[PDB]
């Protein structure tokens, strides 16, 4: 993709999990023996074939050996720059001399989808600069951006239509105008299927290698792609990989830690920083989940595992706040436009954010920085959320100013029980359809809303604003005296109630028996009774007690009939998504919970089950899992004959939330007031680890013993 995910795609995006046909391939086919060898395991039949793949933290290399001819392809990407790097290393180890032809295919799609843009993608070759340049200039908002293949060489032969490549009766295995011939005609005209190949033509020797370099990138305006495509193919490859192995390598190595276990140190040192990183706020996409616009709570709590991008995001979250006092929920990044929806909890979510970021950075002048409004047209009580354009206003105001706001707002959309309404859906989208024009009441958004104003009364008391702090005073008061009357079923923590008052969450209800939401928030927040918080943490035992699947059930009783219409929940097969099934965010503050309250080996025991590694695909025969093991996902499935399957990994909102939750909830670093507190509490199965982070440039050896002490110099708990 170049701009926005799934508006601006270059290659297709099959989400197929059981062909899935490459949309680029790289073939050095022979030319005697008719023999063809592919880096790709996708793209090769041969049963006597090796293939070794390492995926690096920014780069791939993906070698084939076959018949005594390595072909090794590494792929990376170039910072500040839209271009990605193919570098091909053909490596004889025969004892004759051989001939080659190298082949780099691609599919040109531009845009969200194909058989729209089929005809209407234009194709050009130029000869001084043997590049493709393929343009879509039918598309809605991207017809002026060209995409190009170059090489770091003399290209012999290039076409750029499947009909000739591809052809009919063949395969992206057996292209057939790869083997039924030796010239590529160059073809300009427009047909039916766009795409791109090159060519090239190489007599080796036995012993030697040949680095070739294809570049794929784009930029908009045909002359500005020519002066980039000049740049590139000037350019060299290594030190551009060097690069990026270093940025990558100085990121994740401001925190390593050398705890015992061998797959907690392999995915806490490397992994979930990164895969936090470049899949939630460098690129929204992964193979399930294609969505490249800024969300509002994702991108607000992507960045709260970390220090400046916090802040940056703060700012640019909090500047997109309607004058009423609602925000928008989503919004596309150079656009700007978005939707304005009914959902409740998105307001509460930058008073949070504001409160860590003042707490952990201390940095008080944030809470001045004059940011417009937006305008909208409004909203008619018949629809739930509209699109519009949204336009820059006059009025500014500063953060303060817009989170009071937003509290306001909040306090104003109350129903007659006290506690807060959902309208739209609380933190669940699912759970729609239990506010819309009623009194849908909530449990969760409850706690999350008294947790974030226990903080802002303080604000407000340090800025001066008596009657505001006056009002919100007694409101969270108010509130509390509610949750603690009206909330609690007698073991555990309700979740809502509908429109026609029945209790959702309780065991009086046939579906939805037992939430997690507002157990783990109950000690998550602060508030709450330590005595019923432990009961409500020893009821989430219910559900979580399934140790031969390893998973955390959200609900015990998933939705299998429109009792009360909970929304479209109800349409996800049991134990599917957020239906019944294990939910990586939500379990997350299970564990942070567990941890918290001071229960240490059983928040170790918990999140053992989190961990993709040591986590059902850790045998041969744990085929159930079906995904990988090196990165988080999002849901496990928890029903049915697919029990144990993990879906939708990588684009996970549970990567920032789980590397927090091995950050304090076991090793117990914190970032109070500037200064680290250390207060951990090792398993009985550890004896003690030692922990290297680099806060302002300043690396410390942190090593805790069985009981306590650093390093460095003999001191006590909370350093």
């Known amino acids: 993709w170049s701009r926005n995910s799934r508006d601006y795609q270059l290659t297709p995006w099959t989400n197929d999990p059981v062909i899935n046909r490459p949309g680029e391939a790289f073939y050095v086919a022979d030319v005697e023996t008719g023999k063809l060898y592919t880096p790709c395991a996708a793209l090769s039949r041969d049963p006597e074939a090796m293939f070794e793949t390492r995926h690096g933290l920014g780069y791939s290399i993906l070698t084939g050996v076959a018949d005594t001819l390595e072909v090794e392809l590494t792929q990376t990407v170039d910072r500040e720059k839209p271009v990605k790097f193919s570098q091909v290393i053909v490596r004889n180890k025969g004892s004759k001399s051989r001939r080659l032809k190298v082949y780099a295919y691609v599919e040109w799609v531009l845009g969200n989808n194909g058989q729209k843009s089929a005809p209407f993608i234009l194709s050009r070759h130029d000869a001084g600069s043997n590049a493709i340049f393929a343009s879509n200039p039918y598309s809605i908002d991207y ?5 190009f293949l170059t090489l770091d060489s003399e290209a012999s032969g290039f076409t750029t239509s499947r009909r000739e490549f591809i052809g009919r009766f063949g395969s992206a295995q057996a292209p057939q105008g790869i083997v039924a011939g030796a010239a590529l005609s160059g073809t300009t005209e427009v047909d039916g299927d766009p795409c791109a190949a090159l060519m090239q033509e190489i007599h080796l020797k036995p012993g030697e290698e040949r680095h070739m370099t294809f570049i794929l990138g784009d930029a908009d305006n045909a002359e500005e792609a020519e002066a980039l495509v000049k740049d590139v193919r000037q350019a060299d490859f290594l030190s551009v990989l060097e690069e990026s192995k270093k940025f990558w390598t100085g990121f994740t190595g401001q925190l390593q830690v050398s705890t015992p276990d061998a797959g907690f140190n392999h995915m806490v040192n490397n992994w979930l920083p990164y895969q936090a990183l470049a899949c939630r706020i460098l690129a929204r996409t992964a193979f399930y989940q294609s969505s490249g616009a800024f969300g509002f709570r994702d991108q607000l709590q992507d960045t709260l595992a970390f220090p400046d ?5 703060i700012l640019r979250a909090a500047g997109r706040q309607f004058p009423e006092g609602d925000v928008q929920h989503w919004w596309l990044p150079l656009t700007g436009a978005g939707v304005r929806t009914t959902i409740s909890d998105d307001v509460v979510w930058l008073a949070y954010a504001i409160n860590q970021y003042v707490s952990a950075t201390g940095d008080a002048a944030i809470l001045d920085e004059s940011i417009p409004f937006l305008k909208g047209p409004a909203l008619m009580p018949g629809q739930h959320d509209a699109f519009f354009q949204p336009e820059t206003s006059e009025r500014s105001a500063t953060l303060y100013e817009h989170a009071a706001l937003a509290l306001d707002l909040a306090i104003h959309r109350t129903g007659e029980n006290g506690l807060p309404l959902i309208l739209g859906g609380d933190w669940n989208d699912g759970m729609n359809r239990v506010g819309v024009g009623g009194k849908g009441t909530s449990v969760w958004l409850g706690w999350f809303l008294a947790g974030a104003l226990r903080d802002f009364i303080e604000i407000a008391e340090k800025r001066g604003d008596t009657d505001r702090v006056g009002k919100w005073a007694s409101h969270r008061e108010k509130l509390r005296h509610v949750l603690e009357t009206a909330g609690w079923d007698g073991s555990y923590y309700r979740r809502g109630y509908f429109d026609d008052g029945t209790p959702l969450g309780s065991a009086s209800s046939e579906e939805c028996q037992i939430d997690s939401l507002g157990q783990s928030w109950s000690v998550l927040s602060g508030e709450g009774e330590e005595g019923r918080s432990r009961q409500a943490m020893d009821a989430v035992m219910e559900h979580l007690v399934d140790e031969k699947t390893g998973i955390i059930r959200l609900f ?8 009360h219409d909970p929304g479209y929940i109800k349409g996800y097969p049991p134990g599917v998504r957020e239906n019944g099934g294990q ?17 240490a080996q059983e928040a170790w025991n918990c999140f053992k089950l989190l961990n993709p590694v040591n986590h059902a695909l850790d045998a041969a025969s744990s085929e159930t899992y079906r995904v990988e093991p090196y ?12 029990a144990g399957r993990g879906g939708w990994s990588w684009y996970t909102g549970s990567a920032g939330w789980l590397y927090r939750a091995a950050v ?20 009985e199965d550890w004896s003690g680890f030692s922990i290297r982070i680099t806060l302002d440039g300043k690396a410390r050896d942190i090593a805790v013993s069985r009981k306590a ?4 110099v003999s001191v006590s708990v909370d350093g």
């Open 664 to 683: 304090e909830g076991i090793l117990g670093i914190t970032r109070t007031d500037g200064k680290l507190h250390v207060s951990p509490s090792l398993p």
């Open 631 to 642: 990165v988080v996902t999002a849901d496990v499935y928890g029903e049915g004959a697919y």
């Open 556 to 563: 015990t009783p998933p939705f299998s009939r429109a009792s």
């Open 583 to 599: 939910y990586t965010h939500a379990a997350t503050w299970v564990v942070l919970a567990l941890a918290k309250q001071g229960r």
């Open 709 to 712: 002490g650093t390093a460095d």
């Open 309 to 313: 991008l916090a802040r940056t995001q």
């Open 143 to 147: 017809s002026a951006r060209t995409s």
